GROMACS .gro file of C-alpha atoms in nm:
model
  309
    1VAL     CA    1   0.258   1.701   5.702
    2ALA     CA    2  -0.012   1.750   5.438
    3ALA     CA    3   0.237   1.841   5.165
    4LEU     CA    4   0.407   1.513   5.255
    5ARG     CA    5   0.107   1.282   5.205
    6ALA     CA    6  -0.093   1.496   4.960
    7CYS     CA    7   0.153   1.523   4.669
    8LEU     CA    8   0.251   1.149   4.659
    9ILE     CA    9  -0.113   1.068   4.593
   10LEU     CA   10   0.002   1.188   4.252
   11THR     CA   11   0.346   1.021   4.277
   12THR     CA   12   0.207   0.670   4.324
   13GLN     CA   13  -0.090   0.727   4.090
   14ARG     CA   14   0.105   0.910   3.816
   15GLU     CA   15  -0.111   0.963   3.507
   16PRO     CA   16  -0.005   1.029   3.146
   17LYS     CA   17  -0.012   1.137   2.845
   18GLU     CA   18  -0.327   1.337   2.815
   19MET     CA   19  -0.256   1.691   2.939
   20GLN     CA   20   0.040   1.868   2.780
   21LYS     CA   21  -0.006   2.194   2.972
   22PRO     CA   22  -0.153   2.070   3.300
   23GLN     CA   23   0.083   1.784   3.393
   24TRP     CA   24   0.385   2.009   3.331
   25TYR     CA   25   0.210   2.233   3.584
   26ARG     CA   26   0.137   1.926   3.798
   27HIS     CA   27   0.506   1.827   3.802
   28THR     CA   28   0.626   2.165   3.929
   29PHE     CA   29   0.421   2.164   4.256
   30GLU     CA   30   0.557   1.820   4.335
   31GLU     CA   31   0.910   1.952   4.288
   32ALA     CA   32   0.801   2.297   4.413
   33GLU     CA   33   0.746   2.182   4.771
   34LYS     CA   34   1.085   2.011   4.791
   35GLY     CA   35   1.287   2.338   4.800
   36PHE     CA   36   1.213   2.424   5.158
   37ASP     CA   37   1.221   2.295   5.514
   38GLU     CA   38   1.092   1.939   5.551
   39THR     CA   39   1.397   1.718   5.504
   40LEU     CA   40   1.163   1.439   5.392
   41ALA     CA   41   0.994   1.647   5.123
   42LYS     CA   42   1.341   1.763   5.034
   43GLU     CA   43   1.391   1.396   4.948
   44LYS     CA   44   1.029   1.314   4.864
   45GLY     CA   45   0.904   1.551   4.598
   46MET     CA   46   1.143   1.536   4.302
   47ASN     CA   47   1.197   1.165   4.323
   48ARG     CA   48   0.996   1.006   4.045
   49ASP     CA   49   1.089   1.198   3.740
   50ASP     CA   50   1.299   0.973   3.729
   51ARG     CA   51   1.087   0.953   3.409
   52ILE     CA   52   1.044   1.222   3.300
   53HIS     CA   53   1.297   1.491   3.225
   54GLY     CA   54   1.254   1.769   3.492
   55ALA     CA   55   1.451   1.987   3.248
   56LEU     CA   56   1.226   2.296   3.274
   57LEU     CA   57   1.398   2.610   3.400
   58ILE     CA   58   1.224   2.626   3.740
   59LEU     CA   59   1.281   2.258   3.842
   60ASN     CA   60   1.641   2.317   3.738
   61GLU     CA   61   1.663   2.496   4.072
   62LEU     CA   62   1.479   2.204   4.231
   63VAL     CA   63   1.753   2.009   4.058
   64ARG     CA   64   2.005   2.280   4.154
   65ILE     CA   65   1.895   2.327   4.517
   66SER     CA   66   1.871   1.949   4.551
   67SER     CA   67   2.184   1.902   4.357
   68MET     CA   68   2.337   2.193   4.555
   69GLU     CA   69   2.448   2.112   4.910
   70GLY     CA   70   2.243   1.900   4.937
   71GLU     CA   71   2.239   1.836   5.310
   72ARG     CA   72   1.986   1.835   5.410
   73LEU     CA   73   1.766   1.631   5.356
   74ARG     CA   74   1.901   1.384   5.609
   75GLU     CA   75   2.120   1.078   5.662
   76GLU     CA   76   1.876   0.810   5.546
   77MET     CA   77   1.728   1.056   5.296
   78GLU     CA   78   2.075   1.114   5.153
   79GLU     CA   79   2.025   0.762   5.021
   80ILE     CA   80   1.754   0.881   4.779
   81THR     CA   81   1.947   1.206   4.732
   82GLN     CA   82   2.253   0.992   4.658
   83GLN     CA   83   2.097   0.900   4.324
   84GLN     CA   84   1.874   1.212   4.306
   85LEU     CA   85   2.179   1.389   4.165
   86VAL     CA   86   2.076   1.369   3.804
   87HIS     CA   87   2.263   1.229   3.503
   88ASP     CA   88   2.443   1.328   3.307
   89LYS     CA   89   2.328   1.665   3.176
   90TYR     CA   90   2.437   1.838   3.498
   91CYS     CA   91   2.815   1.863   3.506
   92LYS     CA   92   2.849   2.095   3.803
   93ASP     CA   93   2.545   1.976   4.002
   94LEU     CA   94   2.711   1.632   4.024
   95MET     CA   95   3.083   1.674   4.090
   96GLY     CA   96   3.035   1.967   4.328
   97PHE     CA   97   2.808   1.736   4.535
   98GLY     CA   98   3.043   1.436   4.536
   99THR     CA   99   3.227   1.577   4.839
  100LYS     CA  100   2.919   1.587   5.063
  101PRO     CA  101   2.801   1.230   5.009
  102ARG     CA  102   3.172   1.153   5.050
  103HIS     CA  103   3.189   1.393   5.346
  104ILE     CA  104   2.942   1.153   5.500
  105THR     CA  105   3.223   0.907   5.425
  106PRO     CA  106   3.515   1.137   5.515
  107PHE     CA  107   3.399   1.194   5.872
  108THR     CA  108   3.156   1.120   6.156
  109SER     CA  109   2.807   0.989   6.067
  110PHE     CA  110   2.902   0.623   6.103
  111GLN     CA  111   2.598   0.534   5.896
  112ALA     CA  112   2.639   0.803   5.632
  113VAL     CA  113   2.995   0.679   5.640
  114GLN     CA  114   2.882   0.324   5.591
  115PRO     CA  115   2.560   0.403   5.402
  116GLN     CA  116   2.619   0.631   5.116
  117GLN     CA  117   2.894   0.528   4.869
  118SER     CA  118   2.677   0.231   4.766
  119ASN     CA  119   2.524   0.507   4.551
  120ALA     CA  120   2.731   0.633   4.256
  121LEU     CA  121   2.895   0.380   4.212
  122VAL     CA  122   2.785   0.473   3.860
  123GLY     CA  123   2.855   0.744   3.815
  124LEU     CA  124   3.227   0.804   3.846
  125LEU     CA  125   3.300   1.092   4.085
  126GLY     CA  126   3.648   1.168   3.951
  127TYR     CA  127   3.733   1.432   4.212
  128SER     CA  128   4.059   1.341   4.383
  129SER     CA  129   3.952   1.346   4.748
  130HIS     CA  130   3.625   1.198   4.621
  131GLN     CA  131   3.819   0.940   4.423
  132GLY     CA  132   4.010   0.908   4.749
  133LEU     CA  133   3.671   0.937   4.915
  134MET     CA  134   3.627   0.593   4.771
  135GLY     CA  135   3.989   0.554   4.886
  136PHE     CA  136   3.953   0.669   5.248
  137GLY     CA  137   3.724   0.375   5.338
  138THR     CA  138   3.921   0.078   5.189
  139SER     CA  139   4.119   0.102   5.514
  140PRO     CA  140   3.795   0.123   5.718
  141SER     CA  141   3.828  -0.164   5.619
  142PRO     CA  142   3.485  -0.288   5.722
  143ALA     CA  143   3.356  -0.422   6.050
  144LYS     CA  144   3.025  -0.452   6.227
  145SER     CA  145   2.744  -0.581   6.010
  146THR     CA  146   2.734  -0.247   5.825
  147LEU     CA  147   2.917  -0.432   5.546
  148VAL     CA  148   2.598  -0.411   5.338
  149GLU     CA  149   2.654  -0.037   5.352
  150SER     CA  150   3.027  -0.039   5.260
  151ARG     CA  151   3.173  -0.357   5.116
  152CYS     CA  152   2.936  -0.334   4.813
  153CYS     CA  153   3.058   0.024   4.782
  154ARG     CA  154   3.424  -0.052   4.733
  155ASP     CA  155   3.392  -0.208   4.391
  156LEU     CA  156   3.153   0.023   4.215
  157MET     CA  157   3.288   0.298   4.438
  158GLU     CA  158   3.589   0.273   4.210
  159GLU     CA  159   3.628   0.497   3.907
  160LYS     CA  160   3.833   0.449   3.592
  161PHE     CA  161   4.090   0.464   3.466
  162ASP     CA  162   4.276   0.720   3.674
  163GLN     CA  163   4.459   0.484   3.906
  164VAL     CA  164   4.427   0.152   4.086
  165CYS     CA  165   4.629   0.245   4.395
  166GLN     CA  166   4.294   0.386   4.503
  167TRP     CA  167   4.127   0.080   4.344
  168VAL     CA  168   4.347  -0.225   4.421
  169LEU     CA  169   4.376  -0.118   4.786
  170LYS     CA  170   4.069  -0.336   4.831
  171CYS     CA  171   4.277  -0.623   4.693
  172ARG     CA  172   4.533  -0.532   4.957
  173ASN     CA  173   4.285  -0.424   5.223
  174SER     CA  174   3.928  -0.539   5.158
  175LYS     CA  175   4.069  -0.890   5.144
  176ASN     CA  176   4.135  -0.870   5.515
  177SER     CA  177   3.786  -0.819   5.667
  178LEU     CA  178   3.577  -1.064   5.461
  179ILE     CA  179   3.744  -1.405   5.530
  180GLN     CA  180   3.682  -1.350   5.903
  181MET     CA  181   3.321  -1.438   5.992
  182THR     CA  182   3.046  -1.212   5.856
  183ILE     CA  183   2.917  -1.497   5.638
  184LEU     CA  184   2.657  -1.327   5.415
  185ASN     CA  185   2.911  -1.045   5.401
  186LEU     CA  186   3.183  -1.229   5.206
  187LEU     CA  187   2.943  -1.160   4.926
  188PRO     CA  188   2.977  -0.789   4.985
  189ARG     CA  189   3.350  -0.759   4.919
  190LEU     CA  190   3.394  -1.054   4.686
  191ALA     CA  191   3.083  -1.027   4.466
  192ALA     CA  192   3.191  -0.673   4.379
  193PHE     CA  193   3.449  -0.592   4.116
  194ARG     CA  194   3.304  -0.794   3.940
  195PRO     CA  195   3.411  -0.569   3.655
  196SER     CA  196   3.687  -0.561   3.719
  197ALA     CA  197   3.997  -0.725   3.872
  198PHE     CA  198   3.843  -0.933   4.157
  199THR     CA  199   4.105  -1.200   4.139
  200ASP     CA  200   4.427  -1.046   4.268
  201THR     CA  201   4.702  -1.140   4.506
  202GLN     CA  202   4.501  -1.142   4.828
  203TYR     CA  203   4.153  -1.134   4.678
  204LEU     CA  204   4.182  -1.449   4.474
  205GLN     CA  205   4.326  -1.589   4.798
  206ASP     CA  206   3.982  -1.513   4.938
  207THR     CA  207   3.828  -1.650   4.621
  208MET     CA  208   3.925  -1.956   4.820
  209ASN     CA  209   3.773  -1.818   5.140
  210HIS     CA  210   3.473  -1.666   4.966
  211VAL     CA  211   3.437  -2.014   4.813
  212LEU     CA  212   3.522  -2.173   5.149
  213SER     CA  213   3.194  -2.007   5.251
  214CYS     CA  214   3.010  -2.276   5.056
  215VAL     CA  215   2.826  -2.491   5.309
  216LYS     CA  216   2.555  -2.714   5.175
  217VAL     CA  217   1.893  -1.921   5.143
  218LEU     CA  218   2.252  -1.915   5.263
  219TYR     CA  219   2.288  -2.287   5.184
  220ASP     CA  220   2.118  -2.198   4.854
  221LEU     CA  221   2.239  -1.847   4.771
  222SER     CA  222   2.605  -1.874   4.874
  223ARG     CA  223   2.640  -2.173   4.640
  224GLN     CA  224   2.550  -1.990   4.321
  225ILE     CA  225   2.560  -1.626   4.429
  226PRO     CA  226   2.928  -1.682   4.508
  227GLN     CA  227   2.978  -1.792   4.149
  228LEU     CA  228   2.909  -1.431   4.065
  229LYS     CA  229   3.241  -1.348   4.232
  230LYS     CA  230   3.362  -1.631   4.017
  231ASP     CA  231   3.568  -1.396   3.810
  232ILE     CA  232   3.854  -1.376   3.562
  233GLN     CA  233   4.104  -1.501   3.503
  234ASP     CA  234   4.335  -1.600   3.786
  235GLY     CA  235   4.209  -1.917   3.953
  236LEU     CA  236   4.096  -2.206   3.738
  237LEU     CA  237   4.122  -2.430   4.045
  238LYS     CA  238   3.859  -2.292   4.284
  239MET     CA  239   3.599  -2.278   4.010
  240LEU     CA  240   3.647  -2.662   4.009
  241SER     CA  241   3.556  -2.704   4.377
  242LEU     CA  242   3.302  -2.441   4.275
  243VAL     CA  243   3.220  -2.690   4.001
  244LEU     CA  244   3.225  -2.960   4.271
  245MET     CA  245   3.054  -2.760   4.549
  246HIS     CA  246   2.848  -2.612   4.270
  247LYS     CA  247   2.730  -2.955   4.150
  248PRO     CA  248   2.746  -3.131   4.484
  249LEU     CA  249   2.450  -2.926   4.618
  250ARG     CA  250   2.307  -2.882   4.267
  251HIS     CA  251   2.253  -3.255   4.223
  252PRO     CA  252   2.085  -3.246   4.564
  253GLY     CA  253   1.742  -3.089   4.607
  254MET     CA  254   1.658  -2.720   4.564
  255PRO     CA  255   1.704  -2.701   4.189
  256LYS     CA  256   1.660  -2.329   4.243
  257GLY     CA  257   2.022  -2.371   4.338
  258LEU     CA  258   2.062  -2.451   3.967
  259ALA     CA  259   1.827  -2.163   3.886
  260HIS     CA  260   2.129  -1.955   3.981
  261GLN     CA  261   2.387  -2.237   3.956
  262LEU     CA  262   2.320  -2.308   3.588
  263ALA     CA  263   2.325  -1.939   3.467
  264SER     CA  264   2.667  -1.947   3.616
  265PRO     CA  265   2.901  -2.184   3.434
  266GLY     CA  266   2.819  -2.059   3.165
  267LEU     CA  267   3.188  -1.969   3.189
  268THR     CA  268   3.324  -2.227   3.245
  269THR     CA  269   3.442  -2.585   3.270
  270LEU     CA  270   3.121  -2.747   3.376
  271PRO     CA  271   3.052  -2.905   3.036
  272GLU     CA  272   3.343  -3.144   3.070
  273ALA     CA  273   3.312  -3.513   2.990
  274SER     CA  274   3.239  -3.551   3.362
  275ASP     CA  275   2.946  -3.317   3.310
  276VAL     CA  276   2.903  -3.488   2.979
  277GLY     CA  277   2.843  -3.746   3.242
  278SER     CA  278   2.700  -3.536   3.522
  279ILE     CA  279   2.545  -3.226   3.368
  280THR     CA  280   2.415  -3.452   3.101
  281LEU     CA  281   2.294  -3.659   3.397
  282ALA     CA  282   2.170  -3.316   3.508
  283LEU     CA  283   2.024  -3.238   3.165
  284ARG     CA  284   1.904  -3.600   3.143
  285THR     CA  285   1.670  -3.512   3.433
  286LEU     CA  286   1.587  -3.287   3.244
  287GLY     CA  287   1.450  -3.036   3.485
  288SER     CA  288   1.306  -2.926   3.695
  289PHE     CA  289   1.008  -2.823   3.488
  290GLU     CA  290   0.909  -2.459   3.535
  291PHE     CA  291   0.868  -2.201   3.267
  292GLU     CA  292   1.102  -1.911   3.332
  293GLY     CA  293   1.320  -2.206   3.425
  294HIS     CA  294   1.230  -2.382   3.100
  295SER     CA  295   1.357  -2.060   2.947
  296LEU     CA  296   1.626  -2.034   3.215
  297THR     CA  297   1.737  -2.365   3.079
  298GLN     CA  298   1.742  -2.218   2.728
  299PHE     CA  299   1.877  -1.900   2.884
  300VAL     CA  300   2.168  -2.126   2.966
  301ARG     CA  301   2.128  -2.420   2.736
  302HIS     CA  302   2.452  -2.487   2.557
  303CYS     CA  303   2.613  -2.726   2.312
  304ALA     CA  304   2.809  -2.860   2.121
  305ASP     CA  305   2.837  -3.137   2.375
  306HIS     CA  306   2.558  -3.334   2.212
  307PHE     CA  307   2.276  -3.341   1.975
  308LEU     CA  308   2.094  -3.520   2.258
  309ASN     CA  309   2.176  -3.237   2.499
   0.00000   0.00000   0.00000
């Protein structure tokens, strides 16, 4: 596989601006060796660019051919391919593809089922069975440690605004699999949508159980990272045990808890008189003292609670 290791010597080393004529003729042969055989180099050789355009007429076909079927490529290479479908100038080379990455979803290929819809997810894919291709899986619903491949799909898998019967199904369905075990997973449903709607009938119910996850890394991340799924507007309550089990481990060690626990809340309800006691007692610490953190303080730092604050 010379064409596999020879061309990326340019991909990793990419040089600019100097040559106007030559680099344009150096970008083609990268792309040029994607269009045949070699599933890997079908996924390898267009990739970067990704800055810059690729818009010349010949790499259009390298765009076309590798926005065409596109399988294959491969299963794991369809991951790169998943976002190799360019944006947005190609209208047909995107939506015509959306079936195949969703055909990975629609049938067989338990990985390409689980794997792929985590990709676009921005953008859209407004085709009905492809819309419903984000709507076939919500009843998967998700088992088996592959959650990283699917549950983070479901949210950004959604489109807008067409309809939420293929969106809120998660709220009806994706609220089943997460509360049961799969601990780092209850991130993967609940930290997603997240713009928008996370709190709904069953899925603010799990805003309890996603917050019930909090056990004082997992005992670092789940504290704050589950205040990402802290979301609007339904439950004011749980944010309070998420203010309590936010500031119970916060006031303990690992102030990198606060590195993600402070930039949350920030919306809301921490800076109460109690945190005019306690977060003042937290900002009376004042630290810890580290620079991004020093800025991460100011990234957060609020008022009007005090001059002294």
